[PDB]
Write an enzyme that holds these catalytic residues in place. Structure first.
Site, PDB file in Angstrom:
ATOM      1  CD  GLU A 160      -2.775  -1.060   2.571  1.00 18.76           C
ATOM      2  OE1 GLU A 160      -2.157  -1.129   3.659  1.00 18.76           O
ATOM      3  OE2 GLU A 160      -4.020  -0.992   2.501  1.00 18.76           O
TER       4      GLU A 160
ATOM      5  CD  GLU B 261     -20.790  -0.080   9.663  1.00 19.67           C
ATOM      6  OE1 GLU B 261     -20.108  -1.112   9.837  1.00 19.67           O
ATOM      7  OE2 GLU B 261     -21.653   0.018   8.763  1.00 19.67           O
TER       8      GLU B 261
ATOM      9  CD  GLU C  41     -16.821  -3.262  11.240  1.00 17.36           C
ATOM     10  OE1 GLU C  41     -15.712  -3.051  11.776  1.00 17.36           O
ATOM     11  OE2 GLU C  41     -17.112  -2.872  10.092  1.00 17.36           O
TER      12      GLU C  41
ATOM     13  CG  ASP D 130      -4.069  -3.117  -3.119  1.00 19.99           C
ATOM     14  OD1 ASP D 130      -3.236  -3.626  -3.896  1.00 19.99           O
ATOM     15  OD2 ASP D 130      -4.560  -3.739  -2.152  1.00 19.99           O
TER      16      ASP D 130
END
Ligand SMILES: C[n+]1cn([C@@H]2O[C@H](COP(=O)(O)OP(=O)(O)O)[C@@H](O)[C@H]2O)c2nc(N)[nH]c(=O)c21
Ligand SMILES: [Mg+2]
Ligand SMILES: [Mg+2]
Ligand code: NA
Length: 209
Positions: free
Chosen positions: A13, A123, A127, A148
């Protein structure tokens, strides 16, 4: 500072991290939570599915043909490698990293009728199997721009500090079950990860500014 943009590079990355003032509410907005536990530990998730295996699966197009770049083998989990080679079963495979994990900040898509803080709360709930709650939000907002290098894609996300009610042990005794995250852990137990430098930088910028 409010000015500074910092670019990190890893084998996989390139990521730009820039302090901004407001998050541009819209269609494709990711909000990431940099979580600090009650006892002061930074949190990180291990993604359930690796980026490599997700990509690989999306690249298939035949009943009788399975296709995989060997370079990606070192960026996949045990169960993924097993799934790829379960039928062929050759003597052994090369380029494997048994310590691999896909480190990610918790967080997700901003929904239409949703505030930033509500999104973060919801979220984090989803998660962590309902085990994370936010005591207080930080005031520093970061913009993350990731290229990426393996797939040639650019992603945008926004990050905020979340000081949560739970301790480190509160999230590290029962295993995660949801489809997005296979583990929640202390980022400081990930010193050898490719992502450790820029993730640590994100936390330090969020708390020490
Ligand atoms: C598929 N994918 C997702 N991300 C990161 O994860 C965030 C979420 O991107 P997403 O794919 O829209 O959501 P998902 O992870 O739930 O599927 C992105 O903003 C990126 O920061 C990814 N980051 C890298 N380096 N490579 C990838 O293939 C990749
Ligand atoms: Mg995805
Ligand atoms: Mg999510
Ligand atoms: Na075998």
């Amino acid at each position: 500072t409010m000015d500074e943009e910092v670019i990190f590079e890893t084998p996989r990355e390139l990521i730009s991290i820039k302090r901004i003032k407001d998050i541009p509410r819209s269609k494709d907005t990711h909000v990431f939570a940099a979580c600090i536990t009650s006892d002061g530990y930074p949190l990180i998730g291990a993604r359930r599915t690796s980026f490599a295996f997700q990509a690989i699966l999306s690249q298939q197009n035949s009943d009788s043909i399975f296709r995989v770049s060997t370079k990606l083998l070192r960026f996949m989990y045990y169960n993924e490698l097993r799934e790829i080679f379960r039928r062929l079963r050759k003597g052994s495979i090369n380029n494997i990293d048994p310590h691999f994990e896909e480190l990610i900040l918790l967080g997700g898509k901003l929904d239409k009728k949703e505030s930033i803080k509500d999104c973060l709360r919801r979220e984090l709930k989803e998660e962590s199997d309902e085990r994370i709650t936010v005591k207080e939000f930080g005031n520093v907002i970061l913009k993350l721009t990731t290229r990426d290098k393996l797939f040639n894609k650019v992603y945008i996300g926004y990050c905020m500090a979340c000081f949560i009610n739970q301790s480190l042990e509160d999230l590290s005794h029962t295993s995660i079950y949801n489809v997005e995250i296979r583990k929640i852990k202390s980022l400081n137990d990930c010193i050898n990860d490719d992502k450790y430098e820029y993730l640590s930088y994100i936390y330090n910028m969020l708390v020490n500014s």
